[PDB]
């Protein structure tokens, strides 16, 4: 009877890629919001001008005003600073904390009932910021990070074996880089565990390339970071809510005892559907995987205690 | 540039459903062939008349003459007799041997370079008949069986857990019913082994329903067999070839030592691509599983002995 | 968020083909309903078993009970009888009248706010039956006819010129066969009026093939009627509503003054969106075209005059 | 069976948007080429990392080496300089003539059987440069311009009427801005000529906005130009060739008598298929349209007369 509404805060490469992925799925009308005058308006009109050629019926508009986001079903935060050389990890956390706080207060006011998906680095912590500033219940606040790590690892496995991208699957817990918990046991090619298809040496190498995945694209582009794959990872989450798909994906979810952790967001396997985070799946981990998850959890917990 | 050509022999519900699944993928022009005058012509013109509405550019024609199939990249055999009341195992094998022989001789004459996909039951046996009558090298001859059993098992799991159909995966070896070799270890939900999510008793029931899956659709329809999901399973195999996808799928493939068997077709994991069966994947089986495969193989081998 | 619900009454070739086209669009969960025990259950389960292979997340179920249709956003009626040996013209219509009335009373009870789409022939008359039995307002009741005639005409033109099915467009008014009002002036190939690309005699022969298009498939199949293209045309209408697309399509709509007619369904150009028939567009017609539309309307009133209203 | 191969020269926003639209169609393996080290490599690997999530089987790679384009079925040239404050039409022609010449010499060497699609401004002139430098026959060289102008016009009409983007169609002849030939008679909504649905003043306004559409996006973005829609327009042309769709589209094509002109590229309606430009359709023009097309032709011919090739 009426199409749902998605607002994307940050009309940069990742925000505009997300709008592109969502337009082709015909899942919602889209509002692109950004502080820079003219930019979201132009990307929005440009994308909508592809509609007659590409077949899709969705309206894409741009604003510099959070009021344009009123009555959104899903709001995606793609805005944030990247770490400049001569900038502490704490300086990144403090800058992005202020960015995510201000965006969340504005969007939670214009869409009190929204689902909130965060991308801003560092992701597990920026999800906590969004959670506490919005006042939304836990099922309505989440972050993209595990789907992107998973997507890169699947890509490297598929190219290494030369098999279909559709047939390679991987669950990854934790965050990006050193906070990541790859799971070879939860990594399959057409149902076949990857440990049967690649030697340990090659799996460890592909795991290292996954940990360094975002940095590898930053090195090749030289200015700016990845946008196609992060856009796609977010588009999957938006669509899993709007079409009630009950996807089983790794997402940054608020924990209240799962994996022995309370009071933090971590990258965990969830059922994602029309009521948002519908279930957190607690899977079997080795002592080593549990200890890696716990260490990543401890780092997130002590970063939170330093937030304004 | 010219679109590839696929011929479908048997324009019953299954052949037509396959034509439908192939048309929407925009993967080839499609020729439907059948002995029944008017039927392939009428179904072909109907499906093609959907093109302006559904937006695909595919030409679909019907014929009663195997000449219409000349120069096909792929030919799919869906034709065969229903096992009628009081008809023995051996009578069906004998009727369908003659049907498959006559069709294969004709399609091999008009498309000496084609890939051949068989659906006719009993499927592992009919694959052998088509292979010997065609004279085609083993990489060009294969049967659809495992993808359909895999699909039904995945459906039942997805509905049991109420999760996305996209996120449940299962490898099944062997043929339908009693010759089927389910692999719980090779069955996952979002990378999570299904043994962590469903009790043994439930998994066993879902396996029994999968063995019985074709008969179940038969009992409900009362006349005729499944067509939608057999159609979709065949469409995946046709597309895997035409688009060089290198899909990792269970398909009936000619063995010369793989899984300790020679001189028969069995349901095994393959890499399916632009050169047909490009690899047979040899996976870890338990003693029980290897024995169940050995039994399925012996049964196939004795059927082949009786007939020519 | 919850996916919308579509019920299809009639689980024959066209009902099942419609379910298939809807499933690949991922637009709704689908309930198939038929009187024949097992059939809708069997077709639904088979189609849903394609879902892990084909990538779609929708639940398809079947029932012999109209209660399974409760709370449908869209209900599509595909059931109806074809003319038999020894059966009169007026008997066929009376039999379809009964079938549509019984279905409509059951589906309007279980989904009082639904949009209702009718396929049953004779299509404009059966829409009027559905409209009166349902008590639904006029924006919520409509029939599929013109899209299928448009699609056939477009397919014949595209095959004649050897051009993309995507770049041939045709607006067709009225019903099937003799009730159809084809409009060569509103028929285009990438924006080029088809009268610049095909001479008069060819256009007349492609119009004739379109008028006879349904009977052509019937002659070839020998038992049963077309199902792929009627299925596609209905799926386009169901989607136009559920995703509020505001499609500009020929559908059977209830007229209250449009084209000088009031009190009947006729095939006309509409804006079809999430509030159903949002607008009936009144296009420029020649005197002959207007007279052809008036005679098609008159044959609708001739058919209704014999029905137990 | 092997997937076809498309190379894209220029891995800026437009080249990258093109690769995205092509990846989703699953139509070809893609190679991005650019002079800037790391950039095509990064965009390629980023796009290909979306594949497991979006369900496409296409390999996307990036190179600074033209040799990586060897054996392409289609090569798309998206590279070129934009007009900066204080450079004449002549400066732009000579700069872009130098860029397209160096690109065409390389890509024509590595793929002597390729179809060449040009984006580089000014488009009709830059197509003649690619045609002359490649030595390819006329069916194998073409430019994207009319599809983008049509798409913008169709977008403005659809949003003015609040109707489906799928049901608004427009053929546009000639090039961008003042060279554009809008055709209200070849512009329809669900088959209805747009002159029946909008007053002439509003049409005239949507035409002015179309002539200016390129500059409008540049004003809003402030750095850089449109990329999504130009990307989609080029993707439609690439797909038309690789799947032999025989689409009926406005493209820049080499004329040898058509529309009264020889020895130039102009924006004309073509059938685009597996053999590139398979036909040029000669449509009915009013005196004013014929005169505007002739003036633009004379202008293009004069610009060609001053180039060395």
Question: What one-character-per-residue DSSP string does chain C give?
Answer: ----EEEEE--SHHHHHHHHHHHHHT--EEEEE-SSTTHHHHHHHHHHTTHHHHT----EEEESSGGGGTT-SEEEE---PPP-TT--HHHHHHHHHHHHHHHHHHHHHH-TT-EEEE-PSSHHHHHHHHHHHH---GGGEEE--HHHHHHHHHHHHHHHHT--GGGEEEEEEE-SGGGEEEEEEEEEETTEEGGGTS-HHHHHHHHHHHHTHHHHHHHHHSSS---HHHHHHHHHHHHHHHTT--EEEEEEEEEESGGG-EEEEEEEEEEEETTEEEEE------HHHHHHHHHHHHHHHHHHHTS--
* Interchain CB distance below 8 Å, C45 and B220: yes
CB atoms near residue C282 (< 10 Å): 14
Of the residues C46, C144, C161, C171, the best mutation for testing chain B's interface (the one with the most B CB atoms within 10 Å of its CB) is: C46
- For residue B35, give the H/E element and its range: none
Long-range contacts, C14-17 (Cβ 8 Å, 24+): C14/C78, C14/C119, C14/C225, C14/C226, C14/C227, C14/C230, C14/C231, C14/C234, C15/C40, C15/C43, C15/C76, C15/C78, C15/C79, C16/B228, C16/C43, C16/C47, C16/C227, C17/B20, C17/C227, C17/C228, C17/C230, C17/C231, C17/C232
Return all residues near A298 (Cβ < 8 A) that are at least 6 apart.
Answer: none
* Interchain CB distance below 8 Å, B284 and A186: no
Total beta-carbon pairs less than 8 A apart between chain B and chain C: 145
Calpha distance C183→B53 (Å, rounded): 18
Is residue B176 annotated as part of the catalytic site, yes or no? yes
Calpha distance D44→D18 (Å, rounded): 12
The residue of chain B nearest to residue A168, with distances taken between CA atoms, is: B248
Residues D134/D108, Cβ–Cβ less than 8 Å: yes
Nearest alpha-carbon partner for B267 in B186, B188, B202, B160: B186
Give buried/exposed letters for D244-262 (b at 16+ CB in 10 A, else e). Answer: bbbbbbbbbbbbeebbebe
Q: Where are the alpha helices (DSSP H) in B111-254?
A: 123-134, 146-161, 200-211, 213-221, 228-242
Portion 15-34 of D in contact with B at CB < 8 A? 26
Contacts of C169 in chain D (CB under 8 A): 169, 188, 190-191
The alpha-carbon gap from B301 to the nearest alpha carbon of chain C, in Å, equals: 30
- For residue A179, give the H/E element and its range: none
ω into residue D196 within 30 of 0, thus cis? no
| 3-state class (DSSP) for residue B109 | helix
Phi, psi (deg, nearest 5) at residue C98: -60, -45
Domains recognised in chain C with CATH numbers: 5-144 (3.40.50.720), 151-305 (3.90.110.10)
ω into residue D122 within 30 of 0, thus cis? yes
* Interchain CB distance below 8 Å, D38 and A219: yes
Residues B37/B64, Cβ–Cβ less than 8 Å: yes
Partners of C253 in the β-ladder? C266
- Backbone angle region of D257, left / alpha / beta, with phi > 0 → left and psi within -120 to 50 → alpha: left
Can you give the length of chain C in residues? Answer: 309
Give the single-character DSSP code of B286.
-
Q: What's the token pair of residue C37?
A: 């025990």
Can you give the length of chain A in residues? Answer: 308
Residue with tokens 């509030």: C275
- Backbone angle region of B86, left / alpha / beta, with phi > 0 → left and psi within -120 to 50 → alpha: left
Sign of CA pseudo-dihedral A57, A63, A69, A70: negative
User: CA D104, D107, D113, D116: dihedral to nearest 10 degrees?
Assistant: -50
Nearest alpha-carbon partner for D51 in C179, C90, A160, A233: A233
B89-110 vs B287-306: helix crossing angle, rounded to 10? 80
* Interchain CB distance below 8 Å, B269 and A197: no
Calpha distance D292→D286 (Å, rounded): 10
Give the single-character DSSP code of D82.
P
Residue with tokens 């869906």: B78
Give buried/exposed letters for C113-136 (b at 16+ CB in 10 A, else e). Answer: ebbbbbbbbbbbbbbbbbbebbeb
| Order of strands across the sheet that contains A29-33 | A60-63, A29-33, A5-9, A74-77, A115-118, A141-143, A247-256, A262-273, A276-280
The residue of chain B nearest to residue D246, with distances taken between CA atoms, is: B57
Residues A178/A149, Cβ–Cβ less than 8 Å: no
ω into residue C207 within 30 of 0, thus cis? no
The residue of chain B nearest to residue C24, with distances taken between CA atoms, is: B24
Calpha distance D214→D233 (Å, rounded): 14
Identify the burial level of D97 via C-beta atoms within 10 angstroms of its C-beta, where 0-12 means exposed, 13-18 middle and 19 or more buried.
buried
Name the residues of C annotated as catalytic: 176
D200-211 vs D213-221: helix crossing angle, rounded to 10? 60
Calpha distance C202→D274 (Å, rounded): 27
Calpha distance D149→A66 (Å, rounded): 32
Phi, psi (deg, nearest 5) at residue A112: -55, -25
Nearest alpha-carbon partner for C124 in C175, C74, C64: C175
Contacts of A2 in chain C (CB under 8 A): 244, 274
Nearest alpha-carbon partner for A10 in A144, A210, A151, A152: A144
Contacts of B243 in chain D (CB under 8 A): 1, 3, 26, 57
Sign of CA pseudo-dihedral A264, A265, A270, A276: positive
Q: What's the token pair of residue B123?
A: 């499927």
Q: Where are the alpha helices (DSSP H) in chain A?
A: 13-25, 39-48, 51-54, 89-110, 123-134, 146-161, 200-211, 213-221, 228-242, 287-304
Return all residues near B200 (Cβ < 8 A) that are at least 6 apart.
Answer: none
Sign of CA pseudo-dihedral D42, D47, D53, D56: negative
Could you tell me the end-to-end alpha-carbon distance of chain B, in angstroms, rounded to an integer? 43
Residue with tokens 């030697």: A199
| Order of strands across the sheet that contains A192-193 | A168-174, A180-189, A192-193
Give the single-character DSSP code of D229.
H
Contacts of A171 in chain B (CB under 8 A): 190-192
D146-161 vs D213-221: helix crossing angle, rounded to 10? 80
Q: What's the token pair of residue D2?
A: 């092997």
ω into residue B97 within 30 of 0, thus cis? no
Identify the burial level of D243 via C-beta atoms within 10 angstroms of its C-beta, where 0-12 means exposed, 13-18 middle and 19 or more buried.
buried
Q: How many CA atoms lie within 13 A of D236 on its CB side?
A: 29
Return all residues near B179 (Cβ < 8 A) that are at least 6 apart.
Answer: B124, B267, B295, B296, B299, B300
Calpha distance D194→D200 (Å, rounded): 9
Identify the burial level of A201 via C-beta atoms within 10 angstroms of its C-beta, where 0-12 means exposed, 13-18 middle and 19 or more buried.
exposed
Residue in D20, D139, D169, D176 annotated catalytic: D176
| 3-state class (DSSP) for residue B307 | coil
- For residue D45, give the H/E element and its range: helix D39-48
| 3-state class (DSSP) for residue D179 | helix
- For residue D129, give the H/E element and its range: helix D123-134
CB atoms near residue D132 (< 10 Å): 17
DSSP string, B142-154: EE--HHHHHHHHH
Nearest alpha-carbon partner for C98 in C67, C123, C130: C130
- For residue A306, give the H/E element and its range: none
Contacts of A148 in chain D (CB under 8 A): 49
Phi, psi (deg, nearest 5) at residue A208: -60, -45
Per-residue CA distances from B216 to B68, B164, D17 (Å): 36, 23, 48
Total beta-carbon pairs less than 8 A apart between chain A and chain D: 147
Please name the method used to determine this structure.
Answer: X-ray
Residues D263/A83, Cβ–Cβ less than 8 Å: no
């Amino acid at each position: 009877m009426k199409r749902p509404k998605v607002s994307i805060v940050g009309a940069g490469n990742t925000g505009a890629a997300l709008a592109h992925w969502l337009a082709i799925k015909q899942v919602a009308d889209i509002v692109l919001v950004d502080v820079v005058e003219g930019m979201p308006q132009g990307k929005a009109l440009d994308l909508m001008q592809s509609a007659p050629v590409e077949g899709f019926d969705v309206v894409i508009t741009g604003s510099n005003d959070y009021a344009a986001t009123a009555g959104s079903d899903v709001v995606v935060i793609t805005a944030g600073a990247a770490r400049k050389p001569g900038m502490s990890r704490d300086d990144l956390v403090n800058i992005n904390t202020g960015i995510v706080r201000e965006i969340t207060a504005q969007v939670a006011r214009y869409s009190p009932d929204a689902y909130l998906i965060v991308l801003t680095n560092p992701l597990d912590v920026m999800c906590y910021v969004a959670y506490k500033v919005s006042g939304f219940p836990k099922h309505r606040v989440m972050g993209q990070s595990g789907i992107l790590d998973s997507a890169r690892f699947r890509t490297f496995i598929a190219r290494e074996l030369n098999v279909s991208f559709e047939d390679v699957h991987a669950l990854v817990l934790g965050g990006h880089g050193d906070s990541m918990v790859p799971l070879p046991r939860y990594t399959h090619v057409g149902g076949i565990p990857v440990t049967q298809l690649l030697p340990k040496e090659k799996i460890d190498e592909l795991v290292r390339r996954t940990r360094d995945g975002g940095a590898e694209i930053v090195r090749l582009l030289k200015t700016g970071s990845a946008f196609f794959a992060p856009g796609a990872a977010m588009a999957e989450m938006v669509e899993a809510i709007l079409r009630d798909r009950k996807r089983v994906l790794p997402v940054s979810a608020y924990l209240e005892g799962e994996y022995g952790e309370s009071g933090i967001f971590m990258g965990v396997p969830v059922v994602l559907g029309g009521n948002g985070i519908e279930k957190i799946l607690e899977i079997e981990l080795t002592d080593e995987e549990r200890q890696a998850f716990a260490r990543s959890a401890a780092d997130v917990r002590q970063t939170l205690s330093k937030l304004d």
